[PDB]
Amino acid sequence: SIQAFVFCGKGSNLAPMQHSTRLPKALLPIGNRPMIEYVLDWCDQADFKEISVVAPVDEIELIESGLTSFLNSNHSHHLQDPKKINFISTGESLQKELLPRINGDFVILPCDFVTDIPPQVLVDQFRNRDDNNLAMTIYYKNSLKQQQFFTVYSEILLDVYSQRDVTKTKYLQIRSHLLWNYPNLTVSTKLLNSFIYFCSFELCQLLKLGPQSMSRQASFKDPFTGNQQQQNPPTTIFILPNETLFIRANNLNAYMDANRFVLKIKS
Amino acid sequence: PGISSVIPTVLEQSFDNSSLISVKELLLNKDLIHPSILLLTSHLAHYKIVGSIPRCIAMLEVFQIVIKDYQTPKGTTLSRNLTSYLSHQIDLLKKARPLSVTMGNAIRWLKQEISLIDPSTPDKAAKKDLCEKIGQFAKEKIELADQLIIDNASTQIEESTTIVTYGSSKVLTELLLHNAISLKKNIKVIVVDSRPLFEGRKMAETLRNAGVNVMYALITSLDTIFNDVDYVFLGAHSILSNGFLYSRAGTAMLAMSAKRRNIPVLVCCESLKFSQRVQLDSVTFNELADPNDLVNIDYENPVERRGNKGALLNQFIKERKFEKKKLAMENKPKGNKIGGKKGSEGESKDASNEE
Amino acid sequence: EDRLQAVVLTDSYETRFMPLTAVKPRCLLPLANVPLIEYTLEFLAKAGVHEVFLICSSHANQINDYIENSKWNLPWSPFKITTIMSPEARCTGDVMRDLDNRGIITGDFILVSGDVLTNIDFSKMLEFHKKMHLQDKDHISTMCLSKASTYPKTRTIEPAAFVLDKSTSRCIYYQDLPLPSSREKTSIQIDPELLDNVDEFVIRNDLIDCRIDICTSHVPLIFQENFDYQSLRTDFVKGVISSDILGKHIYAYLTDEYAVRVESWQTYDTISQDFLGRWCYPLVLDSNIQDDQTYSYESRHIYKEKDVVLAQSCKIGKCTAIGSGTKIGEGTKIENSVIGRNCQIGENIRIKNSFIWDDCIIGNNSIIDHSLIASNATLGSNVRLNDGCIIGFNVKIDDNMDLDRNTKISASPQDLDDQTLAVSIVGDKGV
């Protein structure tokens, strides 16, 4: 039932390296070490035998050559390149395509990863607390602005609001039904999602019937609200996401922060 | 293979009869163990609800899942590596939490069933009949037998009565729920609780959810609540050969007071709960747990305080030792309600020979 | 640090209690057979007040006479009471300007709106107020808050949502919501002027209002400057936050222990049930504060004063209190209910979750359930009542009378049904 998924793509946010056909986003040295090495090291620690890797239309054998040569791997990886992806579809269309391969509960983790955290304890929390989703938040730099806002419950630990300030209006707006239930709420500014996602089996029933997901963040975890109307047919446990806070440095790399990760390693 | 030795806290000068250690957070194990066992061991290590009765029911269901998931190898037959795999389960269960008596009778039943079925019948035809038999066995010995305890107690309890209880026994929760709903009496239920586990708190919560007149109290304050009380029900774990009541923590104290203050103690029990191992004091074989549960300062289980106590290893003799399973003295309880209806604890082993 | 003066806002939440406050004042009403002011004054004495101020206008004569009879007119008292007489019925802002014109405010003063009973020690509060005042110069007022009963699903009258700092504990927003009673509005708009100055935003609705204030000498000057502000919470706090004077701060204090302000009838009922229970550890009936009180604690939360008379073969319940000089007849059930001093009770009377004040006579064979009775009012024979049925002063209900849910009875001999005189609108009678 348990299996891990590695999500590979191509970067458009970065300035210089990625535009070349020979070099992909998966194979990039940051601190004299390859990027996908840390993903393989994590999966080896978490104890997973069934790992399947998804790939875009570009780089069909370059990822397969990187997994075989140099890299410790010692695991059977299933690399596939679907043709429905158009870049303008990113990952949700990839998720809707491959669904009969998954037998039970699945873990989604992108290729753009830097990790310095214990892996097994995140898996154990997913297994014990008995819910659909779990996400991780990590602090921004402290050594010598409008970004994004998360809401966290603290006693069971849950997630409610994750929407950014890009298309957000002049005023901060909250709904009453979503506040009256779960009355205590903590809003985070410094804490950021490092793309760690845990998922259950019962997600397979809804992905084939109703296409609603976007960018694997905006309308991925947001369908959870048992509020106001309640109209979408549920799979039978209340649809509820989770969150856990961490101190150590482990975050995403997509923008200008990639140069700061090199400064973090060399110390 | 597993983690063994190296234990928190002092070895202790007094009381060192049992193991005080074990795996909470999963690190370095065999990659063949069925995850439903791994779930139950992680459950029972820090469990708040279970107390003797429900532990075996879950253990049976986990076994039923394993047999349903069991596919016989082409080379090795059914009775080849199964019993070794089961021995690995029990050893992992032992590492997490010392087993109950009812668990032992289940294992003994299962090992009898392995010997009964010879490797000659087809695989899918075998396991289909096996799980059906286990289901019928669990129906009879637990669920139906429980219903028999219910009705036996129903005749015994008088109309409009006050009852003081203790623990988190499944049989008694259903007993009182039956009294509140089906029979409709004026039942004042008082619940007592200890420090390591808020078992009675959970029972009272569930009784409140039914809508019962509930008082909630502690061991420290009893000579005030008693001076009111009629029948006292105790959550059985095991009744031994002699007729000593091996049960949870704050049980014997209550048993003593009730014997002293006229109106006595009653105990509901299962025919699977009886053992043949005998003892006379609490020191003999105790279910010891780590003082990590006693670190917290009052109120709830998770509070996380910068309080007064914190050190155990570095402190020059500071044994904050608590026990879980105690022994009530023989004469003090009066009634036992089982599969075979009734019988005083003086009689005790009239079920073990009857089988 | 010593010398502290206090101002008490009375004549503030009148007619919020609908059938009462007709002849006698708001705060005169007893919680546990003792006036609401007495609780507040006890809180003042425990805090350490040297000078007391009171705001009386409506029924002011009865208040002044009660202070004359009080334990504080006597010379040994740590505080002296001086009453402020104002025009009849005005907002809190108008009284603030009146007091600033008179000019008695020195340094740090105290303001309490309504009557609050709390077991929380104030010495800690004063220290943390002073520590935060030494942090920065432009700092104004202090607010008290306590943790709610897990979910405030039954609490509808106080829907106040608070946005608070994790580091400095500064309030950001105040909002009222109709939500569960009236499903109409959902939206709450917040000002984004304080986003990166705070960073650690914490939004909570799970906090109970107290309306107890430690205030600086700035406050009465601001009220005179900005005379548009009528309220002290809804418009004032929000006005202070939203860049009226830049660099000015207001406190929000979190406390784990019990602190609830009285405002409504069903809130009053919960506080009273909390007082009968051992929620307020120091504030218990047995300790006796009014000096005339001679209450004694009995097991299973049963309170009895001295000279309690009771008939044989009678059952008493849980969380009950009975006054002095009280007589009870046979076949009576008293469960979760307060009965006042000098109250004569007939026979065969079943009481559950109800309320009776001082000097009340009840007729034989009557069932009273979750319903309130005021002082010097008599109940007849064969009286059946339901939940939330509040009966006014001197109301004589005659024999054979049945009243349904929420049937409020007027205290003055106007618009609502049932009055003070014999057979109250069951046959047209009443002035």
Rg (CA), chain C: 23
Q: Considering only residues 120 to 159 of chain A, which have any Cβ-Cβ distance to chain B shorter than 8 Å?
A: 120-121, 124, 127-128
Q: CA-to-CA distance for C411 and C414, rounded, in angstroms?
A: 10
Which among B27, B31, B39 is the nearest to A120, CB-wise? B27
List CB contacts (< 8 A) between A179 and chain C: 161, 188, 203, 205
Q: How many CB pairs under 8 A join A and C?
A: 67
Exposed, middle or buried by CB within 10 Å (0-12, 13-18, 19+), for A114?
A: buried
List CB contacts (< 8 A) between B25 and chain A: 120-121, 124
In DSSP terms, which residues pair with C203 in a beta bridge? A185, C163
Closest CA to B181 of B216, B215, B148, B209: B209
In DSSP terms, which residues pair with B123 in a beta bridge? none
List CB contacts (< 8 A) between C300 and chain B: 215, 228
Number of Cβ within a 10 Å radius of residue C128: 15
Asked if A124 and B25 come within 8 Å (Cβ–Cβ), the reply is: yes
What number of residues does chain C have? 431
Q: CA-to-CA distance for A44 and C48, rounded, in angstroms?
A: 65
- Going by C-beta distance under 8 Å and a sequence separation of 6 or more, which residues neighbour residue B122? none
> The sheet that has C383-384: what strands, in order across it?
C315-316, C333-335, C350-352, C367-369, C383-384, C401-402
Chain B interface, best mutation among A127, A154, A156, A201, by max B CB count within 10 A: A127
State the Cα angle at C117 between C116 and C120, rounded to 5°: 110
Domain count, chain A: 1
List CB contacts (< 8 A) between B27 and chain A: 120
Domain enclosing residue C218, as ranges: 5-276
Which among C185, C186, C202 is the nearest to A187, CB-wise? C202
Q: Is C265 in contact with C146 (CB distance < 8 Å)?
A: no
User: What is the residue type of C172?
Assistant: I
Domain enclosing residue A167, as ranges: 1-267
Nearest residue of C to residue B217 by CA position? Answer: C300
Q: CA-to-CA distance for B322 and B249, rounded, in angstroms?
A: 9
List CB contacts (< 8 A) between C161 and chain A: 179
Q: Looking at the complex, does the CB of residue B206 fall below 8 Å from at least one CB of chain A?
A: no
Asked if B26 and A120 come within 8 Å (Cβ–Cβ), the reply is: yes
Exposed, middle or buried by CB within 10 Å (0-12, 13-18, 19+), for C410?
A: buried
Q: CA-to-CA distance for B244 and B101, rounded, in angstroms?
A: 14
Chain B interface, best mutation among C281, C298, C299, by max B CB count within 10 A: C299
- Going by C-beta distance under 8 Å and a sequence separation of 6 or more, which residues neighbour residue C326? C305, C307, C308, C309, C339, C340, C341, C342, C343, C344, C345
DSSP-derived pairing of the beta strands C326-328 and C308-310: parallel
Asked if A184 and C192 come within 8 Å (Cβ–Cβ), the reply is: no
Q: CA-CA distances (angstroms) from residue B185 to A15, B178, C335, C366? A: 78, 10, 18, 24
Q: Looking at the complex, does the CB of residue B297 fall below 8 Å from at least one CB of chain A?
A: no
List CB contacts (< 8 A) between B215 and chain C: 300
3-state SS, chain B, equals: CCCCCCCCCCCCCCCCCCCCCCCCCCCCCCCCCCHHHHHHHHHHHCCCCCCCHHHHHHHHHHHHHHHHHCCCCCCCCCCCCHHHHHHHHHHHHHHHCCCCHHHHHHHHHHHHHHHHCCCCCCHHHHHHHHHHHHHHHHHHHHHHHHHHHHHHHHHHCCCCCEEEEECCCHHHHHHHHHHHHHHCCCCEEEEEECCCCCHHHHHHHHHHHHCCCEEEEECCCCCCCCCCCCEEEEEEEEECCCCCEEECCCCHHHHHHHHHCCCCEEEECCCCCCCCCCCCCCCCCCCECCHHHHCCCCCCCCCCCCCCCCCCCCCCCCCCCCECCEEECCCCEEEEEECCECCCCCCCCCCCCCC
Q: Where residue C232 sits, what CATH number does that domain have?
A: 3.90.550.10
Asked if C205 and A172 come within 8 Å (Cβ–Cβ), the reply is: no
Q: How far is B88 from chain A (nearest CA, A)?
A: 20
Nearest residue of C to residue B216 by CA position? Answer: C300
Q: CA-to-CA distance for B34 and B192, rounded, in angstroms?
A: 38
Q: CA-CA distances (angstroms) from residue B63 to B66, B87, B145? A: 5, 13, 21
Q: Looking at the complex, does the CB of residue B300 fall below 8 Å from at least one CB of chain C?
A: no
| Helices B53-69 and B123-138, packing angle to 10 deg | 170
- Chains in contact with C, counting 3 or more C-beta pairs less than 8 Å apart as contact: A, B
Which among C189, C196, C206 is the nearest to A171, CB-wise? C189
Q: CA-CA distances (angstroms) from residue B302 to A242, B113, B198, B298, C117? A: 19, 43, 12, 10, 30
Element (H or E) spanning C431, and its range? none
Q: How far is B41 from chain A (nearest CA, A)?
A: 11
Q: Is C416 in contact with C406 (CB distance < 8 Å)?
A: no
Asked if A175 and C187 come within 8 Å (Cβ–Cβ), the reply is: yes
Which among B25, B31, B42 is the nearest to A47, CB-wise? B31
Q: Looking at the complex, does the CB of residue B26 fall below 8 Å from at least one CB of chain A?
A: yes
Closest CA to B190 of B234, B224, B229: B229
DSSP-derived pairing of the beta strands B326-328 and B245-247: antiparallel
User: What is the residue type of C118?
Assistant: T
Q: Looking at the complex, does the CB of residue B227 fall below 8 Å from at least one CB of chain C?
A: yes
Nearest residue of B to residue C300 by CA position? Answer: B225
Q: CA-to-CA distance for C249 and C133, rounded, in angstroms?
A: 9
Experimental method: cryo-EM
